[PDB]
Amino acid sequence: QEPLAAGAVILRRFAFNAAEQLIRDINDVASQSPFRQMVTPGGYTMSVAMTNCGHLGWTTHRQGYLYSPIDPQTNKPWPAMPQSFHNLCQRAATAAGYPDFQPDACLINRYAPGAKLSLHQDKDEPDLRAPIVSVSLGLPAIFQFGGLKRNDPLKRLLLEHGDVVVWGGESRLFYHGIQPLKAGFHPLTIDCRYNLTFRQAGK
Ligand SMILES: O=C(O)CCC(=O)C(=O)O
Ligand SMILES: [Co+2]
């Protein structure tokens, strides 16, 4: 299935089949670059653990964000993006109408019950030409999606295991975020939610 909105679609239950292989390749990456909490420059500490794969990796600190080839926690390169991450990503991107997308970054998020991503706009990328591909894995989450300005009426959507969201073009600098993840069980993730966001950061 494929719905909305405006240079952005939801590919519903798109990563369903590959979820077992994604989870496995998430784990493989994690055994190299582990998950960790990150302190926002505003002093707040994020309830979302995260790590990276691909050419570039995004981390926030006290001075601010950074895209890096080096993992600041290991002082070695971020794991190469797994075959299945790459394949899945462009297969989503094509179906979303971005045939010439190729990411170099992949920020992997892990949410516990009560974890939240504050409303933000994917901003720290120089090349606004490329779209964002978000993969939802595990427990269901409510993903809010507004627009350019902060005050745009947000719309609340249930993102479920396998669900995929691609946004770019006119909808690229759009405010979006995550509400406190409700507790539950999922076969594959047990009691959490994984989320991959694919991005072009270099080029
Ligand atoms: O968990 C999500 O679906 C949101 C991910 C996101 O927007 C980000 O990593 O910047
Ligand atoms: Co984002």
Author numbering: 12 to 214
Provide the authors' original text about this structure.
In Escherichia coli, cytotoxic DNA methyl lesions on the N1 position of purines and N3 position of pyrimidines are primarily repaired by the 2-oxoglutarate (2-OG) iron(II) dependent dioxygenase, AlkB. AlkB is a member of the iron(II) dependent 2-oxoglutarate (2-OG) dioxygenase superfamily that couples decarboxylation of 2-OG to succinate to oxidation of methylation damage primarily in the form of 1-methyladenine (1-meA) and 3-methylcytosine (3-meC) upon binding of dioxygen to the iron(II) cofactor. The AlkB enzyme recognizes and repairs other alkylated DNA lesions such as 3-methylthymine (3-meT), 1-methylguanine (1-meG), and 1,N6-ethenoadenine (εA), albeit with lower efficiency. AlkB repairs methylated DNA damage in ssDNA much more efficiently than in duplex DNA and displays significantly different activity on structurally similar methylated bases.
Here we present the structures of the full length E. coli D135A AlkB in complex with ssDNA containing a 1-meG lesion and the unliganded wild-type AlkB holoenzyme. We determined the structure of the full length E. coli AlkB protein in complex with a 17-mer ssDNA oligonucleotide containing a 1-meG lesion to 2.2 Å resolution and the structure of the AlkB holoenzyme in the absence of nucleotide substrate to 2.9 Å resolution. The protein was crystallized under aerobic conditions in complex with 2-OG and cobalt(II) as the metal ion. The use of cobalt supports DNA binding but prevents catalytic activity. Greater insight into DNA binding and substrate base recognition comes from a comparison of the AlkB-ssDNA complex with the AlkB holoenzyme structure. The hydroxyl side chain of T51 is positioned to make hydrogen bonding interactions with the backbone amide nitrogen of residue Y55 to stabilize the conformation of the T51-Y55 loop. Superposition of our structures of the AlkB-ssDNA complex with the unliganded AlkB proteins (core r.m.s.d = 0.772 Å) reveals little difference structurally in the global conformation of the proteins. Instead, our data indicate that AlkB is a fairly rigid molecule, and the flexibility and dynamics of the nucleotide recognition lid is more localized to residues Y76 and the T51-Y55 loop and not the whole domain, although we cannot rule out movement of this domain during intermediate DNA binding steps. Our comparison of nucleic acid bound and unliganded structures reveals that residue Y76 undergoes a conformational change upon DNA binding necessary for damaged bases to bind in the active site and subsequent catalysis.
